[PDB]
């Protein structure tokens, strides 16, 4: 197709307009006084959301150049969401800040390459500063706060996340699903997380988020490589009569089979997923039988006297719910054989005492811990499915923030952290003036998230900004109460991870963009 | 379909406009202050790229005739990138200048074909002059420089390429792939790789490793479909007396032979790896004999007159270690003597001179390359996908640059080489005054790269040009720091190949383009 | 003063050191200094000489060294007698800057249909 081509300022102006039209839509959601965006997902009812990445992802624009700028920044939000839960709106605001300031500086005629280079220098130093600044978060209390604040000041959500991580342990798997009724509920259930994802992205169905959730999935527990579903087509027949999805957990699935699934599942009877049998060798057979007990199934191989041709409804495992993602699968609540489950537990422990060689102790300890943790599930309470999505999303942000916190701990939230580091870096300089002004752009931009958060209040942004700067250490602004104080004591806790991630990815993309003189895009008509 | 046809200046003017549009898109990227172009990739995030040939490919214009101009200059860009990875932008700028000056000379009424001949004559002399200027590049430091300069002054990248080329020697294969961390990382697949592996899991003695590794393995090089253990009996005796494992590089992983060798592996009597022979037919045979001599063995098959019983300890190959994978084998320090290995490479070089078909040419080069050393892999570290692509492209350019440098030497970069050769050629003349004009056209265009590099800096191009021309030898302009000096001592090194290649292709396409009198294209409907 | 735009470009080179309180004032200063070269380059371009080379050569010269557009020779403007009154240069510059400042600060325009 014939390409339109633009140069210099025309390109830059087009870009910047597209950026703004995305950012402004994202950034309205920021902080405690942010407010919701309505996304008209064609399928049905619109979804009201406060998640910035959910907003950004939808934004697509009519002008090919403005759209190009928008799609570019879109990347930032998705990256941040892929590192961490929170931080997608902060990362977008930072990116748009750098871009704006940087383009201003380029209009002064300064070299964009050196501008980019200077931004990168600042970010590196900034990241280092945050690291040192971060106070480890380990007190359940602090964990709660982190939760709460990521939940948009939702006390109850913080409570539940803290209690769940207490009950399963901080390393334990926790999951969130549409609850049955009005109230939030928490319970711990017999389930398993093993580190294998979908064997193909074509199994991604219901969620957009690169995952699949299946209700009452059947589990074919076969330590074999599936060449063609012919080997179990009467099982898929059976499963048709079920009308309930089948999870293959097998050593491999050939693309022949995968393509046959593509031919028959969504285009036909029932959705089917395949996952790699976890671990390897004797371990993988071990885990498959560990899951058979967890699900009341059997291991399907001729070493057992079983065959893919023969596995009954009852030779396959039964789970109530399974989640699969790019990298991991969580059997949420296997039917299983509870007494046998516990007996297995005791058995595996005995091998810890027998298989006392260091790495055997390790694997066995892992497996017992895995089985003993089970899984927690958080049931989101809502009157209406609209609020279901909204609250559920708010919870998952809390969840991902808490784990991130537990990893790296917390820094003074509300954007104080970024300002603080900014102030520390004021003496940082580059090789040349272009890099020096690039550094100043970076530092400057770090202000943006505070100002934005204030602005959403409709408080007077520059005033708050200036005072906070005047303050020192943890001194910040509480935007839910319009009071200066020790942010920590208030519990406005940001996990260093999210802030670090947001800054890196924001600068990363931003620095590139400024350097553009020319854009090649298809003529609209 | 009904063709539109235009003549004379209605043709050339339109054609030139197309050329200009493409060039201007490309040009911006030239040099250290050259700056990125955003190429829309409708399915995905746009590609931010500084690779000029990447730019060229996308350019395509609505106006049929302007399109023609673009399409033909596009061709020189691409051809440049085929000959050598770097130099695509230089070739474009050159082509633009020649075309521009040629069309101008034609407007004077010069015989176009004489111009073309004059251009061609000048170009030939310039190639010879570059050959004369070129100083061998050999020291690692120069390699680093060339890599740096081609990397867009990315010192780290130059360092990494140079040390990688050292670790695997000049002739080693080096490849670049998407890393995961922020930090770039270099790995090497040690030893004699060959690209065939096991086709069952039961060979794996190291299940946590997920591959088969053997220490002090003997190597039964039976390039055949092995049948039975019976033929191995005396071999197995010698093996068991040595107490060493055995690598079965069969033709194909087949036969009861291997099945019972797996049985012996499970009994711990002898541990055995088995893999396909690489390639087919005579080239398959050749690889097995190359493995053999390198391993200090000899191809143990009846098709070369030796039944498997007949193998001495000079026919069985050995290594300190071997590893075999799903798809690949590597042999670590085969016991074959270094003199035998070198000699074997000599016969392979004789075979290379005998080979007249890519089926054997590329494969023979791969044999000698792997015999010279392992394969290095450069993992490009970047925060963001956009960086992934952008950084990767620069790395790849650096890689192909260094290669070219090693093979043909280097000249003073920043376009000084072209300037110098142009000045040396000022005495050249043709058969007739039309031809002489064409020569001067060529010599004048040689300035264009230098000027364009300067212009991107926003510096007076002709001022810099004149001062450079006034200087002698490697005296030039450093566009990264805006001061003149010995270009070589600064380390701004260009591979002669890329300079030479870029010039030739530029000249060829341009010299044709100026002789256009009529263009025929479908009407715009 | 050296008439041939020499004076302006001379002073422009002299003041390159000057800098302001912030990037906005710095770009403003740079804009002013760059413009002052414009007379010389225009005069030359009318000749169809290369403005860049002549400008640089004048800048690299000293005092009244300048480009005689009538003859294309370089020389001392005074010896040739290419004399601008000082007032003319000064007034030209100041008034030019005045309008520019007016225009930059201009926020609204009112006219009939
Ligand atoms: N009560 C509060 N006072 C000040 N800042 C707050 C408060 N509650 C939340 N914030 C800040 O708002 C941001 C969280 O809002 P959110 O929309 O989740 O941003 P993101 O999507 O980037 O996580 C964090 O910077 C957090 O510190
Ligand atoms: N520091 C420098 N000073 C001057 N010229 C440079 C410098 N670094 C690189 N160059 C020049 O930049 C030119 C263009 O390089 P590049 O951007 O890779 O375009 P191409 O695709 O033609 O190689 C090269 O001829 C190189 O000599
Ligand atoms: N021979 C010459 N070479 C170069 N510059 C000249 C020459 N003669 C006059 N000038 C300069 O040309 C400039 C502009 O000329 P002109 O446009 O006629 O005057 P003004 O711009 O004041 O109306 C004057 O500043 C003058 O000194
Ligand atoms: F704005 Be986010 F996703 F916390
Ligand atoms: F623009 Be290139 F390939 F250096
Ligand atoms: K938000
Ligand atoms: K380039
Ligand atoms: Mg948040
Ligand atoms: Mg290059």
Numbering used by the authors:
A (entry chain A), B (entry chain B): 2 to 526
C (entry chain N): 412 to 524
What did the published study say regarding this structure?
pmcChaperonins prevent protein aggregation and promote correct folding through ATP-driven cycles of binding, encapsulation, and release of substrate proteins. GroEL binds to non-native proteins through two apical domain helices (helices H and I) that form a hydrophobic collar around the entrance of each GroEL cavity.
The map displayed an asymmetric ring and a symmetric ring. The apical domains of the remaining three GroEL subunits were less well resolved and they extended upward, adopting a conformation reminiscent of the GroES- bound state. The conformation of the four substrate-contacting GroEL subunits resembled the Rs1 conformation previously reported for GroEL-ATP. The four Rs1 GroEL subunits shared the equatorial-to-apical domain salt bridge, R58-E209, not observed in our previous study of GroEL-ATP. ADP bound in the asymmetric ring showed additional density that we attributed to the ATP γ-phosphate analogue, BeF3.
